[model samples]
Target chain A: FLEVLFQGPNNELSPVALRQMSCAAGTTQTACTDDNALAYYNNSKGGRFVLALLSDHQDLKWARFPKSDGTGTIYTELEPPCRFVTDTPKGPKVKYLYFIKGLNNLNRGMVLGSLAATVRLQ
Target chain B: FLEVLFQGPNNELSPVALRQMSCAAGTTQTACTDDNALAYYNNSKGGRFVLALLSDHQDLKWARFPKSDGTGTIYTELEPPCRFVTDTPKGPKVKYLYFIKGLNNLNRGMVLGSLAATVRLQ
Candidate 1:
């Protein structure tokens, strides 16, 4: 997973930034600001990046980059191999953070048996 | 189905020629010689060809031709779109003959239900 944060001017709050932030959170990055301001995560593996736009109200919308070599290869984020983070209004959000903590590979079976079971017992 | 046939010199056969013939029969064609003396079938949709050696013992062996473009697109024979034929010692051997006679698309369901039923009954 990849993460990004967008701050509103004077904390005025723009849904555009929130929406772009959400979209970027799903993948690795987002592109904005006339393709100049690109949000990306540079990790040990390959990098993920995107292009987006920001309005006067601090709104953002971005698109994924397509491979241009004409080999029909498209950039896709693989399952996170490690963990990282991004800052947001809420707090320092963890991106792929569970990966680093060894909480990785927690499939449905483990989810149902351990963490979920502990929560249910509580 | 794509089909091919090979004849021997005065019927004196060689394993090399038979091997090449077998290989050519598996796919569309094979490459033999100094890239000359090619054997091919020109059909409406596309073409199939092969090159082989005719010795005193009438032996033949050939290789598949790889696509020249660097895109890694190898030519593959699709499931027979139509029927065709080739000549061999076994007979005028019907190549894709079943294909032309509407035995096409004979999946497990059709084969088990119709033709296989008739054969089992007999």
Candidate 2:
């Protein structure tokens, strides 16, 4: 439904870029409109290296991954709390992002699957 | 059905050993089979298959995305380099890598989707 380009292995104290991609979904996701996308920016902090997606369709979540013991099979909403940190040699030093459909209670999501991403570590 | 270990964030012209993964797919993807793998080695080089997965599978299609740029809003089996490259602010350049299962075309199978993976880049 949308696409996101992340910015900053920044910090647990700043904004993450959340660009929108065109969609097959109707309404909120028209072919392409300002209503089609949103981005958080400048001086407005505290997503904790998070890129919270804003839409009625997709929900976004993130995290640090690959447990030091490497005991985990998939990423989770657990610790390392979505920070795009690079100060370590551990895995999930990689910031992970995902999308779930939107909801009202504003709690956690099912997260499609184990699919995720990473960049050069620090 | 084993696991993979990447040496060299190394070099592209260098060898990249492909490993195994446990799968329920049977035969090759047995619940961890030593018969299910292959890897290149020792000074052997030149197979840039590339580790191409990143956070979230939604934005990962081979074609193009975010059609708003008039570029396109979807993905197919085309576009972009799926290689990982990293250059430390200090200069330890590492390239990303990955693998693909082999098939005899004894028949045709549906692709699970564009599932993929990644690592730091140089």
**Highest DockQ against the true fold, candidate:** 2
Tens-place lDDT digits, model 1, residues A4-114: 111134322111111122222222334321332223222223433322211112222223344444444333333222222234456653222111122222121111111
TM-scores vs. true structure, each candidate: 0.14, 0.18
Instruction: For candidate 1, give the lDDT of residue B66.
Output: 50
Residue B45 shift from truth in candidate 2, angstroms: 36
Model 1: what is its DockQ? 0.00
**TM-score of model number 2, chain B:** 0.18
lDDT of 1 by residue, B1-122 (tens): 11111113432211111122222223224433233222222222232222222121112222334533444323323222212223455564322211112222312111111111111211
Give the DockQ of candidate 2: 0.01
TM-score of the A-chain for all models: 0.21, 0.18
Predicted complexes: DockQ each = 0.00, 0.01
Give me the candidate number with maximum TM-score: 2
Task: List RMSD in Å for every model shown.
Answer: 27.3, 20.7
Model 1, first chain, TM-score of 0.21
Candidate 1 collision pairs: A31-A50, A31-A51, A31-A52, A32-A52, A32-A53, B16-B60, B17-B59, B17-B60, B39-B50, B40-B49
- Model 2: residues with Cα > 4 Å off, grouped in runs: A1-81, A86-120, B1-34, B37-122
